[PDB]
Amino acid sequence: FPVVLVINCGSSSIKFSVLDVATCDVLMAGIADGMNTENAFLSINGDKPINLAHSNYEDALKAIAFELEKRDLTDSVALIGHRIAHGGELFTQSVIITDEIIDNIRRVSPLAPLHNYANLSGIDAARHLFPAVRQVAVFDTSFHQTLAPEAYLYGLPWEYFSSLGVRRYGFHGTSHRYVSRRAYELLDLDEKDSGLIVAHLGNGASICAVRNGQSVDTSMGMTPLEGLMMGTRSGDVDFGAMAWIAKETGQTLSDLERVVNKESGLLGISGLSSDLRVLEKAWHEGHERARLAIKTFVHRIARHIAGHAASLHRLDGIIFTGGIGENSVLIRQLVIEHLGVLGLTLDVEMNKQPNSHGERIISANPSQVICAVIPTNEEKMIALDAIHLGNVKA
Amino acid sequence: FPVVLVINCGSSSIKFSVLDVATCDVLMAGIADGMNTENAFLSINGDKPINLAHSNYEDALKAIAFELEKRDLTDSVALIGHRIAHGGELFTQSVIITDEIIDNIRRVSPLAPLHNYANLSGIDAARHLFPAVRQVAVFDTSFHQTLAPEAYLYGLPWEYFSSLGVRRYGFHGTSHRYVSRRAYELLDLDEKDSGLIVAHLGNGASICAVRNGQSVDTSMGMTPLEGLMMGTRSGDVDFGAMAWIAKETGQTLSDLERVVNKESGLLGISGLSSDLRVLEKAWHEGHERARLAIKTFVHRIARHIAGHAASLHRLDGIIFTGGIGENSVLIRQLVIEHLGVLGLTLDVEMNKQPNSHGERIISANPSQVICAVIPTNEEKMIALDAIHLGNVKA
Ligand SMILES: Nc1ncnc2c1ncn2[C@@H]1O[C@H](COP(=O)(O)OP(=O)(O)O)[C@@H](O)[C@H]1O
Ligand SMILES: Nc1ncnc2c1ncn2[C@@H]1O[C@H](COP(=O)(O)OP(=O)(O)O)[C@@H](O)[C@H]1O
């Protein structure tokens, strides 16, 4: 009974899951938080947080490695999957990790400094601790590499693109890829002749247009800051406005970089919380700013969903996914009602069902476009890639 | 036979037109360019440029005033219309100019430094030269004041909005207003129950969603730099990307402000010209970058047109206007073909007709949405407002 160890190293954390190769089910999950801090810990399934105080990425993973051995899981780990934030234009699909891949990942890392280097730290650690184990790299950007130039180019001088690599990349690639595959099943669509819009709505949020199985447009840009307004991220924002704000408050780009990434979006408008649940209750209790934050959030989602549909020859479905897309009854309803122009019809009773109902259709029959909620499973998608690559002769 | 003198003062020019109150036809037009420069001139209808060397906004208008007197037009000027770039949240409609209006215009001027002060210079000059003449102010932003908060708010901290006035304003207001009024006629639509998308495509470009006669979404933002990619303007651009570019080339925001306003868009991508005509020929001749610039330009227009449609309850028509929208056969075709998802059907023979054919429908019957070209006439719209206001008792 082989298992797949899936890893995701962030700037200050290391999330992991152990999936059964046979059923792709989670057998164990955990997270080492407070990384590089004088006080780091490891909590597995909730079990009392261990003391990983003063430990680097490798020790943290060494601790996680011991927790797998203390549960006789070590010997059944046949594959390891690493989630990589940015793959530049070098990676269009998941790959078996070798020295060349590591080199390539370093090459594109300048494009995602705050994430890629942590991803690499994770790779080095895993390689040290599981030498005889095949390891795979899954890039959050690879699914969007099918985008045409007209869809990934910015209106900046050509030089910025050709010599600096400035262009739209998009993220949530693994989710958008996974969810759209699931959609062809659920909606009984022919992948080769289909038009889908996936709305990945989490604390990080993005839209993706999948035409005939391929991503043809996505909302995030060179960085995860473009597109939809999010939990603490601003989303699209007039550069002239950002420039004006700079001259008025005497702030630098790093100051504004912080504001737009940490103090904006839902948090910034509501001045209350980045958490939707908190905001939904706030609205219910009469909080005006919480209502404006949500309304704005919904307005921008509807706008991009419609905008992205322009890259499809035909619109067959709109799929909601992510923590927010899977659990927010109201947001889904508001977004959908904001898209009546596309002929969407919601089945409120179906939309009311909690996420325990899994992959489900929430639109009524008269609906011109099918609407559904499909829980995303990036760990499973990564494992499936690893399993496939596990049959290769490298 | 009274006439209306219409003025538009830019940072370095003063465009003017004299329309007949009876037919709203242009009887004279001109432009004083090279303002504040050691060499300024005044060209009327093409007539040899006069020597306005070393002259401020008032002298330039004094020269224009003499050209109207030298043609016995002075005594028939019953109204003067001033085009104002930015009206903030203070102006929702055109107004008769008084001391209060001037004060108010100064209040919002910080929002458009490079345009509003020139507009005010024009007002002071005109007021000096035509004391007994009623004068009106028409704001490029007023038509978009009907936008809901969810549509004009940015995902920035609430403070930036409430204390600094940072929000979407939108421009091309007079064109969008004028063109949509014309559309209800041409398309035989009931203003009170209608959904239109107007694509104002000139060297400056923006989209506007008009629901039941009111603007409910527009593409430009606090400044004319947001939205569509334009002649030399970038249009939407990932702020994280702009930040990244800053740290890589060691440029400031003023440096980037310049790049995004002067060296980007069509010019930036093609590295050839900002002029569509030049680019269309370049493409025909095999120029790849010119083709990419146009394709990108078209892709972004289609995206925003679809995105803006989300603010409509029903999509009745898409109207093209502006120098590009009125004369570009190819761009209109490409944009429309990029919107097949909305069920649009183009009548190529109708779309081929030159702008001399005026207000015209270019979509075929099977089309779910009517498409048309409606030449814009901002001077006429301004005159109509002035004429209406000419009956007021101030
Ligand atoms: N029942 C719910 N109703 C509304 N929002 C919810 C609900 N459950 C979770 N959320 C929101 O979803 C967000 C976090 O999503 P995230 O976990 O990052 O997505 P993913 O689960 O795809 O990785 C939070 O804003 C959270 O408050
Ligand atoms: N026949 C044409 N085909 C393609 N583009 C054209 C044509 N005529 C003018 N243009 C373009 O339209 C643009 C300038 O538009 P503009 O004059 O600012 O709009 P408006 O006339 O609404 O004020 C230029 O890029 C120009 O090359």
- φ/ψ region of A172 (left if φ > 0, alpha if ψ in -120 to 50, else beta) reads left
Name the phi and psi angles at B334, rounded to 5: -60, -45
Please, are residues B83 and B174 in contact by the beta-carbon 8 Å criterion? yes
A161, two tokens: 């693109």
3-state secondary structure of B19: strand
On whether any CB of chain B is under 8 Å from the CB of A160, the answer is yes
Token pair in block for residue A286:
């009469």
Whether A257 contacts chain B with CB within 8 A = yes
CA distance B337 to B40: 45
Helix/strand/coil (H/E/C) assignment for every residue in A147-199: CCHHHHCCCCCHHHHHCCCCCCCCCCHHHHHHHHHHHHHHCCCCHHHCEEEEE
Q: Using CA atoms, how far apart are residues B157 and B151, in angstroms rounded to an integer?
A: 16
CATH of domain B1-188: 3.30.420.40
**Alpha carbon distance, N-terminus to C-terminus of chain A:** 23
CA A381 to chain B, closest CA, distance in angstroms equals: 28
Distances, alpha carbon B298 to alpha carbons A149, A214, B41, B339, in Å:
12, 21, 37, 11
| Dist. CA B137–CA B119, nearest whole Å | 10
Please, which contacts does A14-23 make with residues 24 or more away whose CB atoms are closer than 8 Å?
A14/A57, A14/A60, A14/A61, A14/A64, A14/A122, A16/A64, A17/A379, A18/A68, A18/A73, A18/A77, A19/A379, A19/A380, A19/A383, A21/A78, A21/A79, A21/A383, A21/A387
Q: Is A194 on the interface with B (CB under 8 A)?
A: no
Compute the distance between CA of residue B343 and CA of residue A41 in angstroms, rounded to an integer: 56
Pairs of CB atoms within 8 A across A/B: 254
Ligand 1 centre and the CA of A121: distance in Å? 28
Instruction: Write the DSSP assignment of A53-94 as a string of letters.
Output: -S--HHHHHHHHHHHHHTTT-GGGEEEEEEEES--TTT-SS-
Coil/strand/helix, residue B380: helix
Contact predicate B333/B348, CB 8 Å: yes
CA distances from B291 to A342, B279, B298, B316, B330 (A): 31, 7, 10, 31, 12
User: Would you say the CB of residue A119 lies under 6 angstroms from ligand 1?
Assistant: no
Q: Within its chain, how far is the Cα of A132 from the centroid?
A: 30
Q: What radius of gyration do chain B's Cα atoms show?
A: 21
Technique employed here was: X-ray
List residues in chain B that are followed by a break over 2.5 Å (C to N): none
Judge whether A1-188 and A189-394 match in fold.
yes
Resolution in A: 2.2
CB of A342 closer than 8 Å to CB of A221: no
**C-alpha to C-alpha distance for B373 and B322, rounded to whole angstroms:** 9
Measured CA to CA, the distance from residue A168 to residue B84 in angstroms comes to: 36
| Residues in B 203-242 with any Cβ partner in A closer than 8 A | 217, 220-226, 229-230, 233-242
The runs of H, that is alpha helices, within chain A are: 57-69, 99-108, 113-129, 149-152, 158-162, 173-186, 239-249, 253-262, 265-270, 276-284, 288-309, 322-327, 329-337, 348-352, 378-389
CA distances to A295, A338, B189, B301, B308 from B315, in Å: 22, 13, 11, 17, 10
* Cβ–Cβ < 8 Å for A21, A385: no
- Which of B203, B230, B329, when mutated, tests ligand 2's pocket best, judged by the most ligand atoms within 8 Å of its CB? B203
Rg (CA), chain A: 21
CA distances from B317 to A129, B188, B372 (A): 63, 11, 8
DSSP string, B280-348: HHHHHTT-HHHHHHHHHHHHHHHHHHHHHHTT-SS--EEEEEHHHHHH-HHHHHHHHHTTGGGT--B-H
Q: Backbone phi, then psi, for B199, in 5-degree steps?
A: -115, 100
Contact A392, A137 (CB under 8 A): no
- The reply, when asked if residue A326 is annotated as ligand binding, is yes
3-state secondary structure of A356: helix
Task: Tell me how far apart the alpha carbons of residues B309 and B305 are, in angstroms, rounded to a whole number.
Answer: 6
The full set of domain ranges for chain B reads 1-188, 189-394
* B181/B194 Cα distance (integer angstroms): 11
Q: Of A219, A223, A185, which is closest to residue A205 (Cα–Cα)?
A: A219
Q: How far apart are CA B328 and CA B14, in angstroms?
A: 27
CA–CA distance, A387 with B15 (Å, rounded to integer): 68
> Among all ligands shown, which has an atom nearest to the Cα of A374?
1
**What b-and-e string marks burial along A198-231, b requiring 16 or more CB atoms within 10 Å of the CB?**
bbbbbbbbbbbbbbbbebbbbbbbbbbbbbbbbb
- For residue B169, the tally of other CB atoms under 10 A from its CB is 32
Measured distance between the N- and C-terminal CA atoms of chain B, rounded to whole angstroms: 23
- Give me the residues paired with residue A79 across strands: A4, A134
User: Sign of torsion, CA A292 A298 A300 A306?
Assistant: negative
Burial of A269 (0-12, 13-18, 19+ CB in 10 A): buried
Torsion of CA A380, A381, A387, A389, to 10 degrees: -160
Return the SS3 of A28: strand
Token duo for residue B284: 């025909």
Which helix H or strand E contains B248, and what residues bound it? Answer: helix B239-249
B270 Cα to chain A: minimum distance (Å):
7
Nearest to A222 among B168, B241, B307 (CB): B241
Distance from C-alpha of A385 to C-alpha of A91, rounded to nearest angstrom: 14
Q: For the sheet containing B360-361, what is the strand order? A: B214-218, B205-211, B195-201, B317-321, B370-373, B360-361
- Burial (CB count within 10 angstroms: exposed 0-12, middle 13-18, buried 19+), residue A271: middle
| Residues paired with residue B199 on neighbouring β-strands, in sequence order | B207, B320
Rounded CA separation A121/A118 (Å): 5
Show the CA angle centred on residue A333, arms to residues A332 and A335, nearest 5°.
Answer: 65
Closest Cα partner for A83 from A320, A326, A383? A383
CA distances for A92 relative to A86, A99, B193, angstroms: 11, 18, 47
Regarding the beta carbon of B276 and ligand 2, being less than 6 Å apart is answered: yes
How many Å apart are CA A85 and CA A57, to the nearest integer? 17
Residues facing A95 on adjacent strands: A137
Beta B77-84 vs B3-9: how paired, if at all?
parallel
Atom of ligand 2 nearest to the CA of B325: 12
**What does DSSP say about strands B195-201 and B317-321: parallel, antiparallel, or unpaired?**
parallel
User: B352-390 burial by CB neighbour count: b if 16+ within 10 A, else e?
Assistant: eeeeeeebebbbbeebebbbbbbbbbbbbbbbbbbbebb
| Amino acid present at A305 | I
Top mutation candidate among A198, A203, A267, A298 for ligand 1, by most atoms within 8 Å of CB: A203
Cα B346 to averaged position of ligand 2 atoms, centre (Å): 21
Q: How far apart are CA A33 and CA A43, in angstroms?
A: 8
Tokens 């010209």, residue located: B273
CATH 3.40.718.10 matches A189-394: no
**Whose CA is closest to A64, among A128, A132, A136?**
A128
CB atoms within 10 A of CB A337: 12
- The answer to whether residues B339 and B350 touch, using CB atoms and an 8 Å cutoff, is no
Which helix (H) or strand (E) segment holds residue B243: the answer is: helix B239-249
Residues A268 and A250: their CA atoms lie apart, in Å, by 20
Q: How far apart are alpha carbons A264 and B74 in whole angstroms?
A: 55
**Whole-number Å distance between alpha carbons of A271 and A284:** 16
Residue matched to tokens 């089309």: B367
Cα separation of A264 and B158, whole Å? 9
Tell me the CB-side half-sphere exposure of residue A12, using CA atoms within 13 A: 6
Q: Which ligand is nearest to the CA of B330?
A: 2
Q: How far is B177 from chain A (nearest CA, A)?
A: 22
Number of residues written out for chain A = 394
Separation CA B153–CA A229 (nearest Å)? 11
Q: Cα separations (Å) of B32 from B12, B137, B241?
A: 8, 20, 39
Integer Cα distance of A252 and A246 in angstroms: 6
The single residue listed with the structure tokens 């739209």 is A168
Packing angle of the helix pair B288-309, B276-284 (nearest 10 deg): 120
Q: Which of B238, B260, B287, B298 to mutate to test the interface with A (most CBs of A within 10 A)?
A: B238
Give residue A346 CA to ligand 2 midpoint distance, Å. 43
Residue A341 CB coordination number (10 Å): 21
Residue B235 — left, alpha, or beta (φ > 0 → left; ψ -120 to 50 → alpha)? Answer: left
Is B202 flagged in the annotation as binding?
yes
Give the CB-side neighbour count of residue A378, counting CA atoms within 13 A: 25
> Which chain A residues have a beta carbon less than 8 Å from that of B151?
299
Of B245, B254, B313, the CB nearest to A166: B245
Number of Cβ atoms within 10 Å of the Cβ of A89: 14
Which DSSP letter does residue A266 get? H
How would you class A78 by CB atoms within 10 Å of its CB: exposed for 0-12, middle for 13-18, buried for 19 or more?
A: middle
Query: Residue B148: its chain A contacts at CB < 8 A?
Result: 295, 299
Distance from CA of A219 to the nearest CA of B (A): 10
Tokens 């050709």, located at residue: A162
Residue B46: helix, strand or coil by DSSP? coil
Enclosing H/E stretch for B267: helix B265-270
Read off the DSSP letter of residue A346: B
Handedness of CA B152, B156, B157, B159 (dihedral sign): negative
Length of chain B, please? 394
Handedness of CA A319, A323, A328, A331 (dihedral sign): negative
Residue A314: what are its φ and ψ, rounded to 5°? -150, 140
